[PDB]
């Protein structure tokens, strides 16, 4: 009875194994655009992905991760609300069964079709596993996806999904450039939060871009052909792998823009 996204093991249940699920800085949250305040203290955001080295893509039974070599300073996120240098370790998505749902963060309660998470760790902590135990251990860059035109820089990801349909399957995924997943603007909201999957640790500075990327219906339909189950098991399509918005509690969402 492992955690997942169904009736019996979904987000409503996670607090039994992971009591921090009802904690003071859980993610995702609704971003109320009228209450978010412009913060002149935020430095410019720096997303330096030119030297990123992808290694592999993996179906972990809740999503797929595109993994990077993080053994040196190649693809880093700096600036904005962050102190120091955060190294890219992987990205993954959350998505829906229908185009009207799928994102984790919401914007004035609007749900997007999906949400990309580029996960980075604070190099002052030496490794990811140490970083997740710190309040400023991780920075996750969140990008909304809406359905419209195709995102060409996503298609390499879409085209390998057939090879990792079921839980535990992985595939070589070198030379993927995550710059092709970024929108034009780096305007963002930022707040302190958590991992949105177990273990739900409260170690993330969230940086959520205002501008969504557009992906095609055909692209998102291929995400929805993945399976939560492993090979040879009854098919459970990998859809609706998102946690809903959690209580904002004693937090302020800051905007980088006027
Ligand atoms: N939606 S999230 O970015 O909060 N998920 C973070 C993850 B992914 B899955 B579970 C938590 B552990 B494994 B791997 B590692 B990273 B961290
Ligand atoms: Zn995520």
Q: Which ligand 1 atom is the nearest neighbour of the CA of 196? A: 4
How many C-beta atoms surround the C-beta of residue 172 within 10 A? 11
Instruction: Please tell me the distance between residue 197's alpha carbon and the centre of ligand 1 in angstroms.
Output: 6
Cβ(119) to ligand 1 under 6 A? yes
Cβ(195) to ligand 1 under 6 A? yes
Distance between CA atoms of residues 198 and 136, nearest Å: 18
DSSP states along 109-122: TBPPSEEEEEEEEE
117 is in an annotated binding site: yes
Q: Which residue, among 136, 140, 138, has the nearest Cα to 28 in the 3D structure? A: 140
E strands, 50-165, in order: 54-59, 64-68, 76-79, 86-95, 106-107, 114-122, 138-147
Distance between CA atoms of residues 252 and 229, nearest Å: 38
Distance between CA atoms of residues 199 and 21, nearest Å: 8
Are 217 and 151 spatial neighbours (Cβ–Cβ below 8 Å)? no
Query: Domains plus CATH for the chain?
Result: 1-258 (3.10.200.10)
Catalytic residue positions? 62
Cβ(197) to ligand 1 under 6 A? yes
Write the CB contacts of 170 (distance below 8 Å, at least 6 apart in sequence): 56, 57, 58, 59, 164
Resolution, Å (one decimal): 1.5
Instruction: Please tell me the distance between residue 180's alpha carbon and the centre of ligand 1 in angstroms.
Output: 22
Q: Which residue, among 173, 166, 168, has the nearest Cα to 236 in the 3D structure? A: 166
92 is in an annotated binding site: yes
Instruction: Please tell me the distance between residue 92's alpha carbon and the centre of ligand 2 in angstroms.
Output: 6
């Amino acid at each position: 009875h492992h955690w997942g996204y169904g009736k019996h093991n979904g987000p409503e249940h996670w607090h039994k194994d992971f009591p921090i699920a009802k904690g003071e800085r859980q993610s995702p949250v609704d971003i109320d655009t009228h209450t978010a305040k412009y913060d002149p203290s935020l430095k410019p955001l720096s997303v330096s992905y030119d030297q990123a080295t992808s290694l592999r893509i993996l179906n972990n039974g809740h999503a797929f991760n595109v993994e990077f070599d993080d053994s040196q300073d190649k693809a880093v996120l700096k600036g904005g609300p962050l102190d120091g240098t955060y190294r890219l370790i992987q990205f993954h998505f959350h998505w829906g069964s229908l185009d009207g749902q799928g994102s984790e963060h919401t914007v004035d309660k609007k749900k997007y079709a999906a949400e990309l998470h580029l996960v980075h760790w604070n190099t002052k902590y030496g490794d990811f596993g140490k970083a997740v135990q710190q309040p400023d251990g991780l920075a996750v860059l969140g990008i909304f996806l809406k359905v419209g035109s195709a995102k060409p820089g996503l298609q390499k990801v879409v085209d390998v999904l057939d090879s990792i349909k079921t839980k535990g399957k992985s595939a070589d995924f070198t030379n993927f450039d995550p710059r092709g997943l970024l929108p034009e603007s780096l305007d963002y909201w930022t707040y302190p939060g958590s991992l949105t999957t177990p273990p739900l640790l409260e170690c993330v500075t969230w940086i959520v871009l205002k501008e969504p990327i557009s992906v095609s219906s055909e692209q998102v339909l291929k995400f929805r052909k993945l399976n939560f189950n492993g090979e040879g098991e009854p098919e459970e399509l990998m859809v609706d792998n998102w946690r809903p918005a959690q209580p904002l509690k004693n937090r302020q969402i800051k905007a980088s823009f006027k």
